[PDB]
Amino acid sequence: METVAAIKTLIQQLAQSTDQFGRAEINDALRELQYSLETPFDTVMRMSLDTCQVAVARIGSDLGLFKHLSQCASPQSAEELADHLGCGRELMSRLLRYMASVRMVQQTDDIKYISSNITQTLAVPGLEAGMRHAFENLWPVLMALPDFLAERKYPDIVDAKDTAFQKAFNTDQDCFHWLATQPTRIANFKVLLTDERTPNFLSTFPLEKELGSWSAEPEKALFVDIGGGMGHACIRLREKYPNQPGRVILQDLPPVLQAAQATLPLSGIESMPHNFHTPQPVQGAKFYFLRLILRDFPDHQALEILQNIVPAMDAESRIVIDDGVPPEKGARWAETGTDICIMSALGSKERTQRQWEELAAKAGLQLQALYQYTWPVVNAAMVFSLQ
Amino acid sequence: METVAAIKTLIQQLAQSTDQFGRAEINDALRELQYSLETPFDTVMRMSLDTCQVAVARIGSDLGLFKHLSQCASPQSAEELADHLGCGRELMSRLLRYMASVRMVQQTDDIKYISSNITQTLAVPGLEAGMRHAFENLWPVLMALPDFLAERKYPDIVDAKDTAFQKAFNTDQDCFHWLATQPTRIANFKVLLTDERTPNFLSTFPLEKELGSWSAEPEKALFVDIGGGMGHACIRLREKYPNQPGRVILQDLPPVLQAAQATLPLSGIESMPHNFHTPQPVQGAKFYFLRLILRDFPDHQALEILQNIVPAMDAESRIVIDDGVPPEKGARWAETGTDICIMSALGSKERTQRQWEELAAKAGLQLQALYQYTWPVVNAAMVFSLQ
Ligand SMILES: C[S@@+](CC[C@H](N)C(=O)[O-])C[C@H]1O[C@@H](n2cnc3c(N)ncnc32)[C@H](O)[C@@H]1O
Ligand SMILES: C[S@@+](CC[C@H](N)C(=O)[O-])C[C@H]1O[C@@H](n2cnc3c(N)ncnc32)[C@H](O)[C@@H]1O
Ligand SMILES: C[C@@H]1CCC[C@H]2C=C[C@@H](C)[C@]3(C(=O)NC=C(c4ccccc4)C3=O)[C@@H]12
Ligand SMILES: C[C@@H]1CCC[C@H]2C=C[C@@H](C)[C@]3(C(=O)NC=C(c4ccccc4)C3=O)[C@@H]12
Numbered sequence: 001m002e003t004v005a006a007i008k009t010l011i012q013q014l015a016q017s018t019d020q021f022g023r024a025e026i027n028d029a030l031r032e033l034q035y036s037l038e039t040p041f042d043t044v045m046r047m048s049l050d051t052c053q054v055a056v057a058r059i060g061s062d063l064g065l066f067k068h069l070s071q072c073a074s075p076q077s078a079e080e081l082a083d084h085l086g087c088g089r090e091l092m093s094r095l096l097r098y099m100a101s102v103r104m105v106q107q108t109d110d111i112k113y114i115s116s117n118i119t120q121t122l123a124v125p126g127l128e129a130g131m132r133h134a135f136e137n138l139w140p141v142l143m144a145l146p147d148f149l150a151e152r153k154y155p156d157i158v159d160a161k162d163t164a165f166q167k168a169f170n171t172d173q174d175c176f177h178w179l180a181t182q183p184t185r186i187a188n189f190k191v192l193l194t195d196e197r198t199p200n201f202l203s204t205f206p207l208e209k210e211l212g213s214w215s216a217e218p219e220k221a222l223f224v225d226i227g228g229g230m231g232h233a234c235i236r237l238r239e240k241y242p243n244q245p246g247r248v249i250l251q252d253l254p255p256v257l258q259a260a261q262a263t264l265p266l267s268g269i270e271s272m273p274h275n276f277h278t279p280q281p282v283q284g285a286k287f288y289f290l291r292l293i294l295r296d297f298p299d300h301q302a303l304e305i306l307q308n309i310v311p312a313m314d315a316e317s318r319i320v321i322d323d324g325v326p327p328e329k330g331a332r333w334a335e336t337g338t339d340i341c342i343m344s345a346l347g348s349k350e351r352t353q354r355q356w357e358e359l360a361a362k363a364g365l366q367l368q369a370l371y372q373y374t375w376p377v378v379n380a381a382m383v384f385s386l387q
Numbered sequence: 388m389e390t391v392a393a394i395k396t397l398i399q400q401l402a403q404s405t406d407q408f409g410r411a412e413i414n415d416a417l418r419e420l421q422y423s424l425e426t427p428f429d430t431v432m433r434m435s436l437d438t439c440q441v442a443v444a445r446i447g448s449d450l451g452l453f454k455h456l457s458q459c460a461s462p463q464s465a466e467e468l469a470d471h472l473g474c475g476r477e478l479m480s481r482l483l484r485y486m487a488s489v490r491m492v493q494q495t496d497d498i499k500y501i502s503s504n505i506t507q508t509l510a511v512p513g514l515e516a517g518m519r520h521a522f523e524n525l526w527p528v529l530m531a532l533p534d535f536l537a538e539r540k541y542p543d544i545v546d547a548k549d550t551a552f553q554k555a556f557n558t559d560q561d562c563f564h565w566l567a568t569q570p571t572r573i574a575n576f577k578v579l580l581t582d583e584r585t586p587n588f589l590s591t592f593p594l595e596k597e598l599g600s601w602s603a604e605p606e607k608a609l610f611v612d613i614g615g616g617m618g619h620a621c622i623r624l625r626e627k628y629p630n631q632p633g634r635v636i637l638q639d640l641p642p643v644l645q646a647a648q649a650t651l652p653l654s655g656i657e658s659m660p661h662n663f664h665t666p667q668p669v670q671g672a673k674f675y676f677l678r679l680i681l682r683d684f685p686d687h688q689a690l691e692i693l694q695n696i697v698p699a700m701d702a703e704s705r706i707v708i709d710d711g712v713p714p715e716k717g718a719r720w721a722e723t724g725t726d727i728c729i730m731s732a733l734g735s736k737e738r739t740q741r742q743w744e745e746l747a748a749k750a751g752l753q754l755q756a757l758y759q760y761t762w763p764v765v766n767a768a769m770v771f772s773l774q
């Protein structure tokens with residue numbers, strides 16, 4: 001129709017006329033519109049069929065299809081793709097028709113196939129690893145959650161060793177320990193750590209204001225990245241503030257510090273092995289930084305992580321929690337969906353600002369400031385002090 | 388933003404100004420815009436989390452939440468919903484926050500919850516049974532499809548007894564035979580038959596023109612509804628053409644014929660047990676009607692169903708296949724997602740018009756006419772004859 005093409009042109013121009021935050025708001029609006037305009041039968045069909053996207057992406061990842069197509073300068077027919085990748089000719093045709101219909105690939109007028117934005121996305125190793133994670137680790141736990149809750153008469157999950165994960169994988173270990181005994185899952189998890197989210201807290205964090213008159217002399221630590229993974233926060237901080245004095249220290253487990261050496265700068269950033277369930281060794285640091293750490297633990301273990309940092313803090317020291325802060329109402333699907341997944345797999349939860357302050361007050365901490373850096377799904381650097 | 392409120396208002400106004408087929412066109416466009424405007428991270432996030440909708444709908448169905456909430460005139464808080472339904476208060480709060488973020492319920496400004504269009508949909512018994520089918524039957528099969536295809540080096544699936552269903556449910560039976568041994572699944576499937584798709588083929592089927600000079604005397608059958616389920620097509624046939632003479636015969640297995648006696652009209656429609664894998668007993672009927680039957684069977688088994696009807700046809704007899712007819716290009720997600728699902732669970736496929744004629748030709752049949760009655764996802768009544 002001419003009406004739908006005018007809608008498309010119009011929303012495209014609006015999207016190009018705003019920033020990434022405006023586009024994310026428009027995308028949420030398009031989603032709400034779809035749900036409001038669908039027939040009752042469309043609703044059931046949508047819930048049933050959108051499940052195929054992860055399964056079909058997983059297949060195409062297994063075949064190298066997205067990485068392959070991303071490197072093609074000319075449209076590819078189904079037959080030449082089936083033959084180059086080792087897939088049955090009829091199976092490939094059907095996968096591609098489904099993929100094109102959800103824009104996983106683009107289909108041409110002569111029934112050939114080029115890459116779309118999603119094809120390029122699924123070719124990026126860190127992002128492909130997120131999709132594979134969702135298939136092999138998230139799906140079994142979501143599949144087990146409804147019968148788990150029914151057998152337990154619908155409890156409030158607060159224990160990482162008593163959730164749907166234990167039923168889904170027939171184990172009594174928590175997810176973290178169980179993952180170490182699985183080599184193929186660790187390999188995908190290692191690639192997941194190389195994906196860097198953008199934007200990051202340094203786009204709005206007023207470091208010079210939060211610094212105040214704090215002195216790095218003699219050799220105090222400016223930034224202690226606790227569970228910092230590949231050290232992306234450390235790297236970005238030195239990049240944005242190359243003249244600010246103080247040690248910048250990456251803290252994680254020895255296996256991931258070794259992997260992080262491939263991409264760390266030759267100097268500037270220290271690598272310090274540390275299990276954050278043990279007392280913090282670095283004393284008097286200005287910023288103790290926890291990005292997407294505490295979300296992965298129930299309140300009682302998340303508190304224990306904080307209590308292990310408190311004894312090392314001066315009056316000028318701050319604990320910076322960089323994590324989701326969903327609002328008390330109007331929370332979006334990306335910050336409530338995650339809440340259901342980590343409940344089912346880790347026994348943890350997303351936390352509103354109020355729940356973050358209540359958790360922190362138990363460790364003797366007080367919220368000094370909150371600096372949001374994504375919208376409309378809230379990620380914020382929360383700055384906590386003592387007293 | 389004011390911008391997204393204006394987008395919603397405008398697309399709502401457009402959606403009300405058109406028919407259901409126009410609304411479906413707009414919805415597909417909104418989906419395409421959403422996928423094209425998401426960031427790479429959004430894409431992975433969407434694939435990871437849209438899974439939760441099926442799991443959470445299953446939980447709400449288990450608790451009776453959607454049926455209960457559809458009967459409430461005033462908004463309900465999480466605490467009172469949790470108490471009435473026997474669910475943890477915190478668990479219920481997190482379920483409701485997730486559901487509200489995907490319009491499964493509606494959240495109010497005072498953080499209470501009321502029904503949405505989707506809440507009402509999930510309260511309808513046949514549509515709830517469709518969602519429950521997707522959870523317990525479909526996506527175990529989808530969870531098994533990638534490893535199944537990888538182990539088998541990506542074959543063309545053509546056999547109902549050698550597909551992802553056998554690995555998902557650790558059986559050697561095909562899906563239909565296995566289902567008959569599962570009482571809880573059969574019950575849900577029985578409820579699923581109560582849902583009547585709308586619109587139906589009688590909205591565009593020119594009965595009188597196709598009938599022509601056909602004579603019902605002595606006692607020929609006008610309409611034989613093969614695998615007709617609850618008999619919805621028979622009922623709507625008698626409602627729209629009450630004066631048309633000829634028998635109208637509902638053919639199905641005794642279990643569903645028995646369950647269909649509740650909603651069948653007292654007279655007009657005969658109930659005749661018949662297994663469509665055996666020769667057709669009604670001789671010389673005008674219309675042999677197969678709605679959403681042959682889509683569930685691979686080519687060789689679909690052909691046997693037709694080969695069993697051909698020997699009972701007159702020159703005036705027609706076989707009417709009412710089923711999906713996807714296009715050769717530009718097929719929609721609702722007709723390609725079904726294809727992947729039935730491939731994985733039943734070894735069957737969706738069929739273009741060309742594949743339907745190829746299959747019918749092998750039974751001695753010839754396409755006479757094709758009457759679409761849905762758009763843009765195509766369902767049509769295809770009229771076949773001998774020679
Ligand atoms: C979400 S991942 C990395 C997130 C990282 N802070 C970022 O935003 O870039 C969580 C990190 O915590 C680390 N981790 C898990 N358990 C730990 C422990 N007991 N001690 C220190 N680090 C741990 C993991 O190695 C992983 O790198
Ligand atoms: C798609 S469902 C019902 C479709 C129905 N024609 C409609 O559109 O309303 C398939 C139907 O075929 C019936 N069926 C399955 N196997 C059969 C068989 N071997 N013989 C006769 N009916 C069968 C089931 O009982 C079920 O009612
Ligand atoms: C990190 C990934 C990144 C891609 C997918 C995301 C989905 C939400 C949670 C599901 C995340 C999250 O936010 N935190 C940790 C878990 C997790 C879930 C199960 C097992 C192990 C970890 C997650 O997947 C998150
Ligand atoms: C009818 C249901 C109603 C709710 C879900 C729908 C989406 C997938 C299809 C595939 C449906 C469909 O349209 N056709 C056949 C199956 C099916 C799959 C496995 C076993 C038995 C049936 C389906 O669930 C369809």
